[PDB]
Design an enzyme around this catalytic site. Structure first.
Site, short mmCIF file in Angstrom:
data_model
loop_
_atom_site.label_atom_id
_atom_site.label_comp_id
_atom_site.label_asym_id
_atom_site.label_seq_id
_atom_site.Cartn_x
_atom_site.Cartn_y
_atom_site.Cartn_z
N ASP B 59 12.84 18.16 10.79
CA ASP B 59 11.72 18.00 9.88
C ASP B 59 10.65 17.13 10.52
OD1 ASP B 59 10.69 18.09 6.90
OD2 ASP B 59 10.54 16.06 7.51
N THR B 92 3.56 19.22 6.72
CA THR B 92 3.82 18.10 7.61
C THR B 92 3.51 18.43 9.06
OG1 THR B 92 6.16 18.74 7.77
CG2 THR B 92 5.57 17.10 6.10
N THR B 93 4.42 19.15 9.71
CA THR B 93 4.25 19.49 11.12
C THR B 93 2.88 20.10 11.40
OG1 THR B 93 6.64 19.89 11.36
CG2 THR B 93 5.19 20.81 13.05
N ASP B 390 13.41 19.25 -0.27
CA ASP B 390 12.20 20.02 -0.01
C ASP B 390 12.16 21.32 -0.80
OD1 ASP B 390 11.53 18.06 1.76
OD2 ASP B 390 11.93 19.17 3.52
#
Lengths: 98, 526, 49, 49, 537
Positions: B59, B92-93, B390
């Site tokens: 993650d 996020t990424t 998530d």
């Protein structure tokens, strides 16, 4: 304008004070009488007819209780706190209080 | 030794192009940490924790948040990830990668005699067009269709390591989110933090996991002679203790007669007995409290055939209060029948791994749930727990904003071309950084094809060409094959809310870090 | 505007108040600007002669 | 250099970090902290004024 | 032989030179953050806390200095915060230049008091000139002077957007908090506007709240989180079991009375909490606390109760909602009263979610319609700077409303002085004409620095500006060239009145007075004595 050295708070003597509660209704009596004492002090102040108080700083006893402040607010009396022992001669000559 | 007459003693100062470009290089260093954790072909990163533990994850946020830096600009990129973790789920990424690229193209302009205010101004204007495009290519969602919601969540867990058991993770998350769609007053909320509790017990396999229609607590019975199984208990929740305590005074009891000492002791026993009578007026089967239970209270409740739990946490009583509908009462004298948690299901005291667990499950209509995880060890349980946390978030995004955008790079390509067609008429100094934003968007499909080992020449040239036509406008990257398939057949759709937040944060991240011309370090604060 | 100026102002006020005090104690004045120093130097020389 | 209206002020920084600006000779001497026992008599002289 | 003081004695040109360098060392910092083309600073402390800002006063107060002549400039900035509100950059720039040019004069055997006298004369004359060359009051411009002033200030900050999104929130928030008073004092207490931060949505999703945003939570998850047409009970005493006072003891000789006396500790409390609800109160706000026993009664009653809020916040809620703060029991020897008629109102009281946090809003309030603003940034770094930037903009608009007079920006006022004062020097120029001319020349540091930071032409751009201000004074044809400044985005002059570039008159009148006096003080530090520090006694 008035200059007060009397502590507008709960009663206290020079001797150690202890109040004993030994009954159910006695507990209410202690709380009720203290409120009456402080209110009675404010009644004396209002009957004189002052508008502004100068309160001298006290060390051992509360100069003004929270209850007394509320009562004085209802009387529309403005309070100036923490007048020093070194201020008294100058204030007295300037305003004319004792 | 005479000192030198200085100001700001023992401090350092850096300024100029060394800072303007230095901050960008710091951002690039952060971006490269999780660059390969975007597509479905990600690998795991194993981090050794400063506290002695081990963290194995892919993650993007769980990786970066544990990396400590010294550079004052690198800290900003880490905070961007931590911020996104709380607003959105899987945003996020792609935010760290995209934000890095926006700074990358800025580095070229700062060397071309372009004022920082021109670069920042153009980037902000581009954001308005990137957000506008996303709202025009959206897809409506009928959130009542169980198959649509299954297809959405199945995609959102594909990237993560839980995808191997997608046939379980999809149902666990979808049901947990629905159970906590609770409305008391005139306000709808979906709460997946206070009432969607996840518990894990080492041992077994993931196929043994389930959603519990109720709650569980790590408690045994107060007394061995109490019932360990009740079909439909009447549950009452208490806040107060069942002991005798001194009052908030200076109590002093004068003992002068032979009967005074033992008479005081009798009243201490009678007090506990009287208040224990008050807590059965509701005819309960189960009494749960938080504080100590006296020996007399244990005896009395045992005699009444009542099962008690001794020391339950406040957060656990708050959860069961919604599962069973009970009200927590802090005074036995003010108990009402309306306080009883009726509709409760089975009570069973189980033994799992030589430890007793209390289950209150199969409730008629609970508004709270617990997810029970099983697995080989704490390591796989930690990975599954994170991925289910998530999986519940993507549901809230769709349920609160029921709009999707084609994924797999199709969104980013369509927006880059929308910017390109408008950029033709900028006719000013901002025309250049405006186009650069359109190019920066490519970093996402560029990363996706690299992670699978495909050519970066054939796929990007072909994909750019396909988006010149008005027939589809939804061509993206097939992360499993390595070719280009239209999203209308892949079915990979992503929440609009995640795409809107991605662009908003990435642009503003660059705005902050391009405005720094000086760094002064070494001062103290008071 | 600044603590350094205010503190000096306090001293400046004190001096001016003391100048009037001096006039109350001894109700007479002389010319300044070096007048008594030059007059003393000349008359004291004549004395010493 | 502190005589007359055309004189200048002094700054003195003590061993604690209290910085003052003053012109009055009495407030200068009290901060100089003269050590020599013969010159310290000038500090007592200024006290009389 | 030498002075018998145990420290160091430095006089003459040694300290006079050091005083100027210390002032220049500070000016060398702020000159780089002047105008809308300036760039932000990053400050890092010893332990690793990073602060990003473009506020001149914040920067200077965070940076440590040693020389007492540098501390003066740090205090100078603090004066601008109190007196002006947005002038925290140029006040140090002007003052340092007065010191530099003054040094060049006194090194030519010009007595320091000749320079000081000229500086005071020219400063007073400069203020007279400004008050005769003003543009307009705030009556002809109406709202335009308030949006223009708000945007002019914000142009130097991270929220310096081209649009009116922030400007509308600034002006409307100030205008919504108008309080009248005796003798024509239309107060705008901008300090009552509650500014909130959240690391969440973009800058363009900031909220303007009609009412008050209360930074607290309801707490116990059994109370209503939304109440419509609420009565608000603002009080300042705790709701807990009643303790005995230190001077009162409970000494019991009859064990039969143990239960009644002990029980009273909880009964005397619950009697009171029922009576603050028997008046119909819906939202109870206390600055003290509510214990586990008392929380039950608000849940059972269907009431909202918010505990441990700040006294400054509750007083603002009570004034905005029309409530009176009650701390005790009174009303003409009454035992329990609770002043039933003194409850406030609000159309809605609701707890909302603000990006993984909880916030209580009290909407519209029905007495004063106070304001709160919730700012949104990508991260903590932006949020901190946005709060400071909003505060500045709120203060600038306040000054416009109080002092109904604006002057041109863009260096126009300084350019006008750079011509008038030079001519003034020729009227009274007997001995101080060198100090008067240098005072005027010092003013050009502002249009000079602005051109440098914008990467524009320097000696030609500013010289052209001065030509326009010269013609207005040497050719009295009413050419009206006195309102022209620099356009830092094009490298050309512009009419600041048509461009809408306005600054409150006081931003420049006060800065000239304070900057001049600060320099004059420093110009009288020719002698310095430093004593050995006392560390170990």
């Amino acid at each position: 304008i008035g200059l007060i050295q009397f502590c507008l708070s709960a009663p206290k003597t020079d001797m150690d004070n202890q109040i004993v509660v030994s009954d159910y209704a006695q507990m209410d009596r202690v709380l009720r009488e203290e409120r009456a004492y402080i209110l009675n002090l404010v009644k004396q102040i209002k009957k004189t007819g002052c508008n502004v108080l100068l309160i001298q700083k006290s060390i051992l006893r509360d100069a003004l209780s929270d209850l007394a402040l509320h009562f004085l607010n209802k009387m529309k009396i403005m309070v100036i706190k923490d007048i020093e022992r070194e201020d008294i001669e100058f204030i007295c000559k300037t305003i004319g209080t004792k | 030794h005479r000192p030198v007459l200085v100001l700001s003693q023992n401090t350092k100062r850096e300024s100029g192009r060394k800072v303007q470009s230095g901050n960008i290089n710091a951002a690039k260093t952060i971006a490269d940490i999780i660059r390969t954790c975007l597509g479905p072909k990600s690998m795991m990163k194993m981090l050794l924790d400063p506290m002695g533990g081990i963290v194995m994850t892919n993650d993007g946020n769980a990786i970066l948040r544990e990396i400590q830096v010294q550079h004052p600009a690198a800290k900003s990129m880490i905070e961007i990830s931590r911020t996104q973790d709380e607003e959105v789920g899987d945003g996020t990424t792609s935010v760290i990668i995209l934000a890095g690229e926006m700074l990358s193209v800025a580095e070229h302009f700062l060397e071309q005699q372009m004022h920082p205010t021109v670069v920042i101004s153009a980037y902000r204007k581009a954001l308005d067009d990137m957000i506008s495009t996303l709202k025009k290519i959206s897809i409506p969602v009928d959130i009542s269709d169980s198959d649509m919601m299954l297809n959405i969540i199945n995609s959102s867990i594909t990237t993560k390591a839980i995808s191997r058991w997608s046939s379980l993770a999809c149902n666990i998350a979808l049901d947990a989110v629905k159970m906590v769609q609770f409305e008391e007053n005139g306000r709808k909320e979906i709460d997946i933090k206070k009432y969607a509790r996840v518990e894990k017990i080492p041992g077994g396999i993931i196929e043994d996991s389930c959603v519990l229609r109720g709650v569980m607590i790590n408690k045994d019975v107060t007394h061995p002679r109490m019932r360990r199984y009740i079909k439909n208990p009447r549950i009452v929740l208490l806040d107060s203790s069942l002991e005798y305590k001194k009052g908030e005074s200076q109590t002093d009891i004068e003992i002068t007669r032979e009967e005074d000492f033992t008479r005081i002791l009798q009243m201490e026993e009678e007090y506990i007995q009287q208040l224990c009578e008050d807590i059965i007026q509701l005819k309960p089967d189960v009494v749960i409290t938080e504080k100590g239970i006296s020996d007399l209270a244990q005896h009395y409740l045992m005699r009444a055939n009542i099962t008690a739990i001794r020391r339950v946490r406040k957060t656990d009583n708050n959860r069961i209060a919604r599962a069973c509908g009970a009200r927590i009462v802090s005074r036995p004298e003010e108990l009402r029948e309306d306080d009883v948690g009726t509709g409760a299901g089975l009570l069973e005291i189980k033994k799992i791994g030589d430890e007793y667990f209390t289950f209150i499950t199969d409730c008629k209509d609970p508004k709270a749930c617990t997810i029970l995880l099983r697995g080989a060890s704490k390591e796989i349980l930690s990975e599954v727990e994170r991925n289910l946390q998530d999986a519940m978030q993507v549901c809230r995004n769709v349920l609160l904003d029921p709009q999707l955008v084609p994924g797999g790079g199709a969104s980013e390509m369509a927006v880059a071309h929308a910017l390109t067609e408008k950029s033709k008429a900028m006719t000013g100094v901002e025309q250049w950084p405006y186009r650069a934003v359109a190019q920066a968007l490519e970093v996402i499909p560029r990363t996706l094809i690299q992670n699978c080992g495909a050519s970066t020449i054939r796929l990007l040239t072909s994909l750019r060409a396909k988006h010149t036509q008005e027939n589809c406008e939804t061509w993206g990257v097939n992360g499993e094959t390595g070719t280009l398939v239209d999203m209308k057949e892949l079915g990979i759709w992503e929440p609009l809310a995640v795409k809107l937040q991605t662009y908003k944060t990435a642009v503003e991240t660059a705005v902050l870090l391009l405005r720094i011309d000086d760094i002064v370090s070494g001062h103290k604060k008071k | 505007s600044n603590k350094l100026v205010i503190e000096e102002a306090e001293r400046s006020i004190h001096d001016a108040l003391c100048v009037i005090r001096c006039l109350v104690k001894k109700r007479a004045l002389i010319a300044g600007g070096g007048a008594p120093e030059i007059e003393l130097a000349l008359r004291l020389t004549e004395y010493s002669r | 250099t502190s005589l007359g209206p055309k004189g200048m002020d002094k700054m003195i920084q003590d061993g604690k970090g209290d910085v003052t600006i003053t012109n009055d000779g009495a407030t200068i001497l009290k901060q100089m902290q003269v050590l020599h026992p013969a010159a310290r008599m000038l500090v007592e002289l200024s006290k009389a004024q | 032989g030498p002075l018998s003081v145990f420290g160091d004695r430095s006089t003459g040109e040694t300290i006079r030179s050091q005083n100027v360098m210390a002032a220049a060392s500070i000016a060398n910092i702020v000159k780089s953050s002047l105008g809308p083309v300036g760039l932000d600073k990053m400050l890092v402390d010893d332990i690793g806390d990073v602060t990003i800002t473009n506020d001149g006063a914040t920067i200077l107060k965070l940076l440590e200095v040693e020389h007492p002549a540098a501390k003066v400039l740090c205090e100078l900035a603090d004066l601008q915060d109190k007196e002006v509100g947005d002038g925290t950059t140029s006040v140090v720039i002007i003052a340092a230049e007065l010191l530099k040019n003054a040094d060049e004069l006194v090194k030519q055997k010009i007595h320091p008091t000749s320079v000081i006298s000229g500086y005071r004369l020219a400063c007073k004359e400069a203020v007279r000139y400004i008050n005769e060359n003003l543009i307009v009051n705030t009556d002809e411009l109406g709202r335009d002077c308030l949006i223009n002033a708000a945007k002019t200030s914000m142009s130097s900050k991270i929220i310096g957007i081209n649009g009116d999104f922030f400007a509308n929130m600034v002006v409307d928030a100030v205008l919504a908090i108008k309080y009248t008073d005796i003798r024509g004092q239309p107060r705008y207490p901008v300090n009552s506007v509650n500014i909130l931060k959240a690391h969440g949505r973009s800058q363009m999703e900031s909220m303007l709240i009609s009412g008050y945003a209360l930074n607290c939570v309801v707490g116990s998850q059994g109370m209503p989180k939304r109440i419509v047409n609420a009565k608000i009970a603002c009080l300042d005493f705790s709701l807990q079991k009643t303790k005995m006072k230190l001077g009162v003891q409970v000494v019991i000789t009859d064990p039969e009375k143990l239960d009644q006396i002990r029980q009273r500790e909880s009964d005397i409390t619950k009697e009171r909490i029922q009576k603050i609800l028997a008046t119909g109160a819906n939202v109870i706000l206390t600055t003290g606390g509510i214990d586990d026993m008392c929380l039950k009664y608000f849940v059972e009653a269907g009431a909202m109760a918010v505990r441990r809020v700040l006294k400054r916040d509750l007083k603002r809620i009570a004034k905005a909602s029309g409530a009176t703060i009650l701390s005790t029991l009174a009303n003409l020897e009454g035992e329990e009263t609770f002043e039933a008629a003194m409850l406030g109102q609000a159309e809605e009281v609701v707890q909302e979610r603000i990006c993984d946090d909880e916030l209580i809003l009290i909407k519209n309030t029905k007495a004063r319609t106070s304001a709160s603003i919730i700012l949104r940034g990508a991260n903590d770094f932006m949020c901190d700077e946005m709060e400071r930037s909003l505060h500045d903009a709120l203060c600038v608009v306040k000054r416009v409303l109080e002092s109904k007079s604006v002057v041109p920006g863009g260096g126009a006022v300084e350019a006008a002085l750079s011509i008038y004062l030079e001519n003034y020097a020729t009227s009274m120029g007997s001995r101080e004409q060198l100090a008067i001319a240098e005072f005027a020349r010092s003013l050009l540091v502002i249009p000079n620095t602005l051109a440098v930071n914008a990467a524009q032409d320097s000696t030609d751009l500013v010289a052209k500006l001065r030509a326009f201000h010269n013609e207005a004074q040497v050719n009295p044809e009413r050419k009206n060239l006195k309102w022209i400044g620099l356009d830092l985005s094009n490298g050309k002059p512009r009419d600041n009145k048509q461009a809408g570039v306005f600054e409150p008159t006081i931003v420049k009148v006060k800065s000239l007075k304070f900057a001049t006096e600060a320099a004059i003080t420093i110009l009288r530090i020719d002698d310095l004595i430093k004593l050995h520090p006392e560390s170990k006694d």
